[PDB]
Design a binder for this molecule. Structure first.
Ligand SMILES: [Zn+2]
Ligand SMILES: [Zn+2]
Ligand SMILES: [Zn+2]
Ligand SMILES: [Zn+2]
Ligand SMILES: [Zn+2]
Ligand SMILES: [Zn+2]
Ligand SMILES: [Zn+2]
Lengths: 399, 399, 399, 142
């Protein structure tokens, strides 16, 4: 039964900064909000709902030695790093994340739920689904000896090639304890492959994936750079599109008609463009793809916003350093997107993408995930980079 | 910035021998051609664009001990032999080749691109795709002990039996780093099998292969002797047909309607018939097939030329000795094909088969691959057997 | 440079409590101790060197569900539990531990050395070496189906049956990044086996293990309950004996002549005796062994101390709850061992057992591991249950 | 086929588990599981009978001489740089088997103890002598 007094309250449902309020928190939920028991005072601070990041990779972080860790490290080391990664992510103001790839994230989610370690609320997609030679193929770039003694990956490993294998892949993701489904619709930038935007899925396989996920109650997110794969994924019926580098007018029309969410991820594109300039940071197979593709994200996102495509907040951290997600807000504001909409996209739209209702707005009966800022973020977006108070589920983690 | 002065220039776009010209080469391209900086003088020479061979096997060469090398040699020995094979091919005037089978050719292409060894520009198809018991099945003729210790080949090994396996095989060829797709539509002569012209593919599987290859920008070439497999491959939508020993009028009509390219390969047809006369050179399973099939190639190619089928230049070297490709120019001319068309088929039509535009004609903005002949090849076709100057991408390899 | 003012100081090299002192810490070591820079004042506290626990299992903890997690849980879950286990162990005043079995411990040591997580300084033995059916056999109690699909363990798994296999086992332990070697000479209480004190090693295998360990700079610790296995291990030349449940006069004489160290581990015996009374806690195979063997660790340790056998400090935590190690100090003092010797056994004798000269005493040039207690432990042995100040390598962790 | 000098090839180098020439040093658990622990066919030995088979397998693969790593090395993915990694019986077995097939033995060594063991076993040449002392020099001269 705590009473949090807030000097200025942000209404994520309306996007307008309100006056002083008081929140009553009991049993991990918000009991009532009163205009104007222990007391937590934030009279000279701005209170907001906890932020949600819809694209993170908490079990990795990009580094010069990243491409050699596949043959030298074990999952235990990745978990020991993910402890600090999750603590840094939680302390930055993000009380919820959607992890879109990795086999360490379900275990970290279980550990956080059991209270062994501190971190945000994780919605884990598990191992991503791809095709042979795809962006998420685990054996791209391996020589013939290792490839032969490791075999050809199949539905149990996440590699699909037919309609009947997609069903088995979705069922195996459900069996391993996933919360949603992730597919790579086209090629990628950071993979050890040749293509970067070629359509790597047929419409039948994506439709099978969506049908199986709907049978199991899952939602499907699709990584996509090229136009043909993006159009195939949109027409199949996926929920969100992870990148839109080569999005055109017809894809925008189809997205608006279907209701697809768009996750721009400015931060990853800026990071790959910056790191492609350093010699030796990326393999020579990867460097041209990054230097070309990554620089065409801010314009497409601005055009999609101007055309009326629903946009959500996601960072693709794991390329960039964890605990620095809030910088994307700045990248949004300097892209033509108003600060109010940028703050809305991480609170009330992220819950719509996630398909839940118990979070996103500071309303009675919802989860008590509250954060505080020293400065007003509407008149100056940089104030999102200094969080002074973090509370999750009624437990204060930063005062 | 080199100036090559040529006494007589051949116009591959028109097929007519022109007068003296001057080519300006800078940065590996042709800058301008002027009728009438270091100077390379070929005053008493005929200048032509570099030749292209659309059917070679640079990782092997036929010999009496060829059929036992499968169990005694390693890929390293084949690479060490290909080192000399590629140089012998380049010095003969062929600055570009299309390799249609072999798992050593992508590595040799990478080595040549990195500048470690000298050779032509390789477009590699990788491992060929076949069916169970097919012409390109890697385990034909093996006893049951070895066949059990190696298992049954699948899509990862290049053997398909359904549409989904065909899709997986094309995707695996893309993953392994291929530039096009090669399928065996019928039986063959040099296989350790029983049939020589039976249809070994169904229309659905070939259509699946063509669709998957089109999804990745690949072109498909088909090896075919019998009429039924040839017709199936033509109707499915392949680009070129590698043989047509039993081509009839309905196939010729279908080829003309669809636009299929024809590669006769006179040299291999003559070589197999000549070597079938020697006792013990070929296995008793192979000798009748060679002695029968190989002798019916020159008549079919002449009839197809008379009927209006588009014909490209290919030799199927690896059966014949490398560095002797130009002899095919003779076999075409003594088959009724004019010398001008024979020279055109290896320069401007080979680029159309390959699907590129930066080579084939000595024009500004195209690659500077130039060769020179001592005698005029139009009046005498034997002059193609004495090349005196070879330059590839602006670098002179033979003066 | 930090100046620590101490009201009373304990000299581990003499076992006497001195007067006020001042310690100068710079670069993570002790510079000068002056009788009588940022100042840390502990004028009303008793300062001691950091304690060392020579028998812990930081990768596990006893639970009613501990006999089904071998088939349900993953090493990542054990790492996430080990983070908290190590933090609790460090906060209790134990700045160094010797881990005597477990696959997670080397990775936890690496993570702590890199600063990713908090914990003590780990000397990890890695896998424990046993024979077929031994106390440390990883497949004890499994059914025929599981034991078939896993195969018979060999020297790579830690199971040996000859001299040449023991050599390979020691070399494999070195290869995996171990600091010492651990073998089980006899049976154990908690194994899924019939025996509790039978000899399971021959003198020729233990001698080979010791000889191979001496090459790589390793020391050998031996688990033993019965008299014959203890005698074999002592005569072979092991460094320390982990339990002495059935030690007799001849074994004590041999230990005195050889100089072997003895680790009683009162806590494990008391815990197993208390948990054997509960119904269903242990499997029916384990319960009689826990009821019988553990009730004799107190009379044997007292007799060994009265006979002049050298005794060190160890708790076997992971059977007991992590963080409660210091309670063993209460068990030794009530067993007849004086408080000063019990305090020396964890500071100056643990360094002799480990073979490191940089720790153990608060002297210039040594590692700055300093702990503080509210009360005087030489008159009340319960004061070791209230640690008020912890410092490891010059960094303050608890103030 | 190609140009170059006259090669006297030793082939695979023989080492022990975790040795300087171990082909699986530094690999993670997954990779090391799908390759198996190297044996005498891969050049890794741990006894006399395994060393005999290793020398015979080197002969079978077309080698001209035998190469062993007596101690640790600088460039390996291992913790040690000069520790003894061969016992005096294994080196003697290697030399005795090599003498049968007409082979000579070269030894990689940095530390003093491994160098001494290799010199007293009867190797032909020593590849490095980083920590050679007076007794090792006297034994080499003798
Ligand atoms: Zn992506
Ligand atoms: Zn991603
Ligand atoms: Zn063919
Ligand atoms: Zn061919
Ligand atoms: Zn024990
Ligand atoms: Zn133990
Ligand atoms: Zn060396």
């Amino acid at each position: 039964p705590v009473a949090v007094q807030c000097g200025r309250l942000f209404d994520a449902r309306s996007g307008q900064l309100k006056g002083p309020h008081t929140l009553l928190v009991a049993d991990g939920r918000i009991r009532q909000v009163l205009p104007g028991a222990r007391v937590v005072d934030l009279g000279d601070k701005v209170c907001l709902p906890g932020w949600t990041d819809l694209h993170v990779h908490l079990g990795s972080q990009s580094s010069p030695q990243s491409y050699s860790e596949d043959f030298r490290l074990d999952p235990v080391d990745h978990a020991f790093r993910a402890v600090g990664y999750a603590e840094k992510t939680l302390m930055a103001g993000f009380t919820s994340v959607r992890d879109l790839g990795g086999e360490v994230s379900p275990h970290l989610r279980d550990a956080i739920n059991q209270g062994l370690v501190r971190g945000p609320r994780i919605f884990a997609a598990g191992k991503s689904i791809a095709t042979t030679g795809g962006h998420a193929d685990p054996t791209n770039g391996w020589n013939e000896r290792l490839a032969h003694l490791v075999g050809a990956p199949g539905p149990a490993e996440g590699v699909v090639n037919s309609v009947d294998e997609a069903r088995q892949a979705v069922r195996q993701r459900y069996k391993e304890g996933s919360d949603l489904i992730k597919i790579t619709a086209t090629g990628g930038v950071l993979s050890y492959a040749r293509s970067g935007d070629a359509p790597q899925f047929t419409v039948d396989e994506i439709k099978a994936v969506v049908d199986t996920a709907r049978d199991y109650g899952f939602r499907v997110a699709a990584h996509a750079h090229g136009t043909e794969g993006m159009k195939r994924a949109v027409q199949a019926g996926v929920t969100s599109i992870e990148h839109g580098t080569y999005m055109d007018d017809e894809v925008m029309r189809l997205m608006k008609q279907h209701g697809t969410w768009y996750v721009p991820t400015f931060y990853a594109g800026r990071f790959v463009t910056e790191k492609a300039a350093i010699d030796g940071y990326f393999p020579e197979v990867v460097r041209p793809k990054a230097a070309r593709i990554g620089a065409l994200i801010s314009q497409t996102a601005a055009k999609a916003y101007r055309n009326g495509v629903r946009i959500a907040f996601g960072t693709d951290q794991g390329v960039g350093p964890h605990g620095d997600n809030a910088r994307e807000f700045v990248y949004m504001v300097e892209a033509g997107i108003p600060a109010a909409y940028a703050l809305q996209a991480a609170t009330v739209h992220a819950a719509q993408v996630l398909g839940v209702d118990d979070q996103g707005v500071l309303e009675p009966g919802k989860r008590a995930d509250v954060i505080a800022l020293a400065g007003n973020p509407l008149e100056d977006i940089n104030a999102v980079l200094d969080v002074r108070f973090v509370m999750k589920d009624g437990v204060i983690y930063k005062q």
